[PDB]
Write a protein that binds this DNA or RNA. Structure first.
Lengths: 134, 167, 260, 117
RNA sequence: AAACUUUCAACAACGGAUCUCUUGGUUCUGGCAUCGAUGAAGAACGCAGCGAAAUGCGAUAAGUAAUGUGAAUUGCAGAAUUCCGUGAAUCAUCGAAUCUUUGAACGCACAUUGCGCCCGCCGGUAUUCCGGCGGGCAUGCCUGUUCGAGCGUCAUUU
RNA sequence: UGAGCCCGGGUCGAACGGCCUCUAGUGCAGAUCUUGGUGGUAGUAGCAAAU
RNA sequence: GGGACCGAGGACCGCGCUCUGCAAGGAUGCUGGCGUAAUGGUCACCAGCGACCCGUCUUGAAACACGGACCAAGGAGUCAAGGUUUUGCGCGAGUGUUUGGGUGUAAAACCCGCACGCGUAAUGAAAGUGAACGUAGGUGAGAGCUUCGGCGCAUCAUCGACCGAUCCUGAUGUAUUCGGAUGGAUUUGAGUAGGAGCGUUAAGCCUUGGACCCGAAAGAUGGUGAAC
RNA sequence: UUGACCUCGGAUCAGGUAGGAGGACCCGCUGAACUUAAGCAUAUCAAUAAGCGGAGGAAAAGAAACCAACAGGGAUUGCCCUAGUAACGGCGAGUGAAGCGGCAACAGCUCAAAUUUGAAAGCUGGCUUCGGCCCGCGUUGUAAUUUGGAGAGGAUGCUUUGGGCGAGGCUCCUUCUGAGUUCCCUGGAACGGGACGCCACAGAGGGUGAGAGCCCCGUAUAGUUGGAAGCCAAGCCUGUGUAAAGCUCCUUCGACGAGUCGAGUAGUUUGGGAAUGCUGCUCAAAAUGGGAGGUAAAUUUCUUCUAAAGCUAAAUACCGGCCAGAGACCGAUAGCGCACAAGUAGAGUGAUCGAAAGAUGAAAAGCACUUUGAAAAGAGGGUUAAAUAGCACGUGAAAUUGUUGAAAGGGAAGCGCUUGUGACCAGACUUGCGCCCGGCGGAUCAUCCGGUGUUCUCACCGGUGCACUCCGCCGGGCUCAGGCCAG
């Protein structure tokens, strides 16, 4: 149950906020799970998707298929990963869109910012686990 | 109405005003009340736990049970039965209980520095000139024009000399 | 809206033409020009008897009647078959008032919902909790567009004593679907008789039961009402030795034979 | 009395619980600033004026200057220690004076006064 | 017997009712007080690759600066544009700028991208000619500054 | 009896129904009713206006 | 003797009779037929008999008159305040928390300190006065009870009793001009003669609001153009 | 001749200010008519709408020339009752307050009238290293003191102080903070059903190819990272001048608002001709004064305040402004005129008037290619779970229309009762128990044994076997039972 006055449990405002979000807010919405090896390595649940993440699809008709993310189409809330293509009438292969909630991240594209992202998550996950424990 | 329809069509952000109030709802600081104030409780059960009184008026409704926060002779004079031409004017001479109340009496009756007031350098020089000439006869210092130009009463100089230490 | 249906400039065409005497929109350069206006029968017109905010929404009920209906809802909760007739899965609890000891609820023993769930499963409220969980269905109608998406059932009602048990058990029972918590000083008829149907399954606490005699002795202007009957069992009234000794002989039978 | 346009001057009170919680937060914010202090001021016991209400007393506006002097409370210190002063009211009787002086001595006994700085 | 006409059924039309949906309205409640001569509200002209609509912006023109996030924008044409980086973005924030003509509208006129004055600069034969640019030039009133008038009025032989 | 109600066959794609209570912007053949759609007149009048 | 239509009810009970059971308070017995169709439904059409086109309005009535090309959707006694009657409910000589305060799981629910509204004694224009002489009375009815002797609800009839006011009579007395006691009236009361009200729910009616829905000519305020 | 002071002007001199917008709420000015009284004019509507002027987050009012008659109360404002009372009226329609009482919130002050006169102590400029220089304003009065339930002046003896830093705190933005994508089925897609789990101070909401607590954003509590501006603030440096302040006493004083009040008159307004208030006009005050009340009480006895100067938060209002949260509301002929190009398209000289119009699919995968021909069109072929979902796009009613089929039709059809003919469609009692014999297996069968739960005498397991009993099963034989219609 909500208790704070600044949060609204309104279907009208929530669907408005989701479909009219700017690109920075759309980045957090298109977040993906980490794989079980990656969870036990960095103690991270989920991060937003980049352009260089090797990923495995777990939902849909392209299940059990692995590939590298080619583009992050934030406008239609969908990503394109490598080699999942569908042929048009002319034979031109157009990429098939997969939601980031339908995939699981196998390899990350690491830089200075991504390490800072993952260190901030494992900071708070350990801090409250210590707080819950002792 | 035409205002609000323009904003929906516009690619400009809706300026979200944070919930700021004029008056703070809770006490703050490093005083006794601020440390023992409970945010979740209300005024009456806070002052219950402190041991104080919030309202001095007549009770305007039913209160919660156990809050304790809302409160011979010859000449026939009723004032004489109540007794115990100037009074002290900047302070009042005053003659199993909650901890916050026990603290509040402790800083109430703690000893306070006097912070005495001194006379100026010219004032003690004015008196030092006066005592050397006349002496301990305060009457002659009152009626002497050259060392008492402000023509002050001998009782005032006597009181001023006592503050300097000279008799 | 008060201005709805009549922010339009229209006038009747009179008896000059063979059209219905309705206000018709002036002008001649649009699709709107010439159409009827201001009628409840007219499209884009004002509705008959517009709804106003000064309708009486709240009704005043006597405090004596409210305290009567709460005491009746309390008594129906102590009656066993009224609980299973309301819908509660009461087939495992070993007593219908079903007091739990305060030591198992008070303090921080229940403030985590894993211990709140364990306490309910042990005392017999387990089927009632799962009944609410397994009954979550989408709402039939148009209230799902108005913020009322799902409907589930009502589980047990926690009743405690805030002075003795504390207020930390509200957090424990808050997220279990169906179970509700109420202090013994502020009992609610909307919770005690949901839907107007008596017999809410109430789990009590040992501190809440000693308090319950005190809170009904402290309501001013209200005493516990005396029933107009002393014994509510009709079969004890009629099939008694006192009444049957002075009765006449029967004049007939339940089945009456056809003479002709 | 529906002779005028009653529809354009009708006031409804759907904010009655909303004004109540706003009123309680104003009293809450008043004791936030005045934390050891009470939220109100001392008012004298006053006798209602007319013959219908002669036999009932109520809270008045402030204490007489003679009532402050008999209780030993200075007049220019009284508003600073939470006592309301009214220079318009007069005693006119010893019973009104004795009742309010006794009230001020009771306030004096219950009072905790703090030393300046 | 066909045609035509009526009734019924199957299939095909016309039309948009019914069911379902809703980035909309309506009503209530709560926190707060913020337009303009430092040029507002409104009107107009322009600014993009393909811009038709809408939105944003002002010749610094779908925008510049600064801060934060951290790798897009996207219907098609982009770059050697940036990826352990002061750094993508039709991103967010926003404290610095730019801000054409009008409009209370302010040198005069206004339906013309016209007609004057004071100060300064630039280019083209150039101290003389021409064109352009920059800062100025409304009314009433207040305080001060400065200038002027009045046998209004005072002093002026020590 | 009736207002109505249940089932079969086809179509169709995401929500809906019974009971007991509460509620109301709650039941249409007419109002030269309102809005929309569509007829006979009629492939007729006639080629005027509009397109 | 011949024919038709019908078989309601479902252990026994009753009245009877020609008494080892019958025709006596309502049909049994026997035999046959029925699944590539017993028996139904809907549509189209034929046949016999029947049978004015609906609504509104006028009138004793018809006859006129108004509306109806067709289909879908919309579409007309509503909501407030104040009265009044009745039903239910809570408490009851009282009743009503919800202006407000306390409180809260936060517009919900729960609690109430003081006043206030209506009621709990009336009458007279007024000064003002003010409910018992009789088990608050007698008598007769009267539901109910009964030790069968009598008690007697509510209510009514009559004879009474008292009080407010009016018209009288006029006591001790009294400030020397104040009083109403006692005794009366073919008097009046929306009087007493032992309380019934307050809050609420449902329905109905009355009044006012747009007031069941639709439908003038007018008048007024403020603007825009320029004239029959 | 010079130089003032006074008054009136100029300057493209320096420094500022006003206009316009908005106007839901607020303060003023001005001001209708329709209606009602079953006609209508007083009245009402209404001190309203329209018109004009002027502010703020509130405005306005406000610290008594008050209310009262009491044992008095005590600035203003708003709620409840007072109360449909008093009061006024074609006494009809009607109109219509206030004091008291209960609450909400409360807070008090500044001048003018005084001689600083042992010292204009005050203030605007513009020139500066900023530390302090001049110019002007002003004595026709700028500071200090004082503002009538007061005060001043002396005396008197106690009691009070002032600045500058300031750690830190509160408010608000911010970063992070729980648990299944485990197995099977259907399905284009699992967010569905079954099994096994987990989190929950989070089972609000939303998205994801169908109903997701555990896929994602968020959601709950406490912390935690960085930032903005206000306010508070433990402490620490400092002060100072015979400087300011509160009282007490008294052989000393105590100034309180004029074309205002009031008398007469005209208008307007009010419940209110003690004129209810206000405005204009004529006349025009007082100082043990003046205002308003009470009272037959014996003369205006008494009570209560002090007008003509001024400021002031809160409780109050709000169809507007910056946001935010909700609903027993409406769901595309509804709800705002506008879910979408909406004050748009369009009309009118102009003021103004003012619409219609939502839905492919999970994803454009929006039909490549072959082939008729001039097209908003077909036939093949393909995409898709589905194209009779093909940007005429969810579902796709009726009116109305075409084709095919059946029947009928001599100057109306339609309808009621009852057959009949033909066409199409449906399918009638679910269609069973009991005995006998023989075999086989079980038990609720053995005074068989061990165990578990329990309402403590009932159930449920495990192992024994078939003396008895009872169930089934298989193979025979037998019995009766039945639904509808006839004779």
């Amino acid at each position: 149950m909500k208790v704070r006055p600044t949060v609204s449990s309104s279907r009208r405002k929530a669907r408005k906020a989701h479909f009219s979000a700017p690109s920075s807010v759309r980045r957090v919405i298109m977040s993906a799970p980490l794989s079980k090896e990656l969870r036990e390595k960095y103690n991270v649940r989920s991060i937003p998707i980049r352009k260089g993440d090797e990923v495995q699809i777990v939902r849909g008709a392209h299940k059990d298929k692995e590939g590298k993310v080619t583009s992050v189409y934030r406008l239609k809330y969908v990503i394109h990963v490598e080699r999942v293509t569908r042929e048009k009438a002319t034979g031109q292969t157009v990429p098939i869109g997969i939601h980031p909630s339908n995939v699981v991240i196998t390899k990350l594209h690491l830089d200075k910012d991504r390490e800072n992202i993952l260190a901030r998550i494992k900071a708070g996950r350990e801090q409250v686990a210590k707080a819950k424990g002792k | 109405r035409e205002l609000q329809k323009r904003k929906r069509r516009s690619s400009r952000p809706t300026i979200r005003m944070p919930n700021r109030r004029k008056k703070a709802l809770n006490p703050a600081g490093n005083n006794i009340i601020a440390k023992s104030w409970n945010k979740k409780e209300t005024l009456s059960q806070n002052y219950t736990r402190f041991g104080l009184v919030a309202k001095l008026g007549k009770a305007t409704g039913g209160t919660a049970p156990g809050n304790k926060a809302l409160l011979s002779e010859s000449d026939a004079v009723p004032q004489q039965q109540q007794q115990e031409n100037h009074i002290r004017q900047h302070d009042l001479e005053l003659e199993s209980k909650p901890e916050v109340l026990r603290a509040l009496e402790r800083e109430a009756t703690r000893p306070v520095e006097k912070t005495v007031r001194h006379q100026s350098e010219r004032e003690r020089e004015w008196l030092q000139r006066l005592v050397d000439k006349h002496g301990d006869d305060v009457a002659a210092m009152a009626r002497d024009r050259k060392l008492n130009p402000y023509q002050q009463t001998a009782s005032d100089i006597k009181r001023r000399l006592k503050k300097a230490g000279l008799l | 809206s008060e201005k709805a249906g009549h922010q339009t400039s229209a006038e009747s065409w009179g008896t000059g033409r063979a059209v219905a005497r309705i206000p018709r929109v002036s002008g001649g350069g649009t699709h709107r020009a010439g159409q009827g206006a201001f009628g409840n029968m007219c499209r884009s017109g004002r509705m008959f008897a517009p709804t106003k905010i000064w309708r009486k929404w709240h009704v005043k009920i006597n405090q004596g009647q409210k305290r009567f209906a709460t005491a009746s809802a309390l008594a129906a909760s102590a009656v066993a078959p009224l609980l299973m007739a309301r819908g509660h899965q009461v087939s495992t609890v070993p007593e219908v008032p079903l007091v739990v000891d305060s030591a198992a609820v008070a303090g921080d023993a229940v403030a985590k919902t894993a211990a709140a769930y364990k306490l309910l499963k042990a005392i017999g409220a387990g089927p009632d909790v799962e009944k609410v969980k397994k009954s979550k269905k989408l709402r039939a109608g148009k209230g799902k567009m108005r913020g009322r998406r799902h409907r589930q059932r009502r589980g047990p009602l926690i009743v405690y004593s805030p002075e003795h048990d504390g207020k930390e058990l509200v957090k424990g029972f808050r997220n279990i679907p169906g179970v509700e918590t109420c202090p013994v000083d502020a009992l609610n008829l909307l919770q005690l008789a949901p839907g107007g149907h008596l017999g809410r399954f109430i789990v009590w606490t040992s501190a809440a039961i000693k308090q319950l005699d005190a809170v009904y002795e402290s309501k001013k202007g209200f005493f516990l009402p005396a029933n107009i009957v002393s014994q509510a069992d009709l079969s004890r009234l009629i099939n008694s030795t006192e009444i049957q000794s002075v009765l006449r002989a029967p004049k007939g039978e339940a089945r009456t034979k056809r003479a002709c | 009395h529906f002779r005028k346009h009653w529809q354009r001057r009708v006031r409804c009170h759907f904010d009655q619980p909303g004004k109540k919680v706003t009123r309680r937060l104003a009293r809450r914010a008043k004791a936030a600033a005045l934390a050891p202090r009470p939220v109100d001021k001392l008012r004298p016991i006053v006798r209602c004026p007319t013959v219908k209400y002669n036999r009932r007393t109520r809270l008045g506006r402030g204490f007489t200057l003679e009532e402050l002097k008999a209780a030993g409370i200075p007049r220019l210190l009284a508003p600073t220690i939470g006592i309301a002063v009214d220079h318009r009211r007069k005693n006119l009787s010893e019973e009104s004076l004795a009742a309010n002086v006794q009230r001020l001595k009771d306030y004096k006994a219950r009072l905790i006064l703090f030393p300046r700085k």
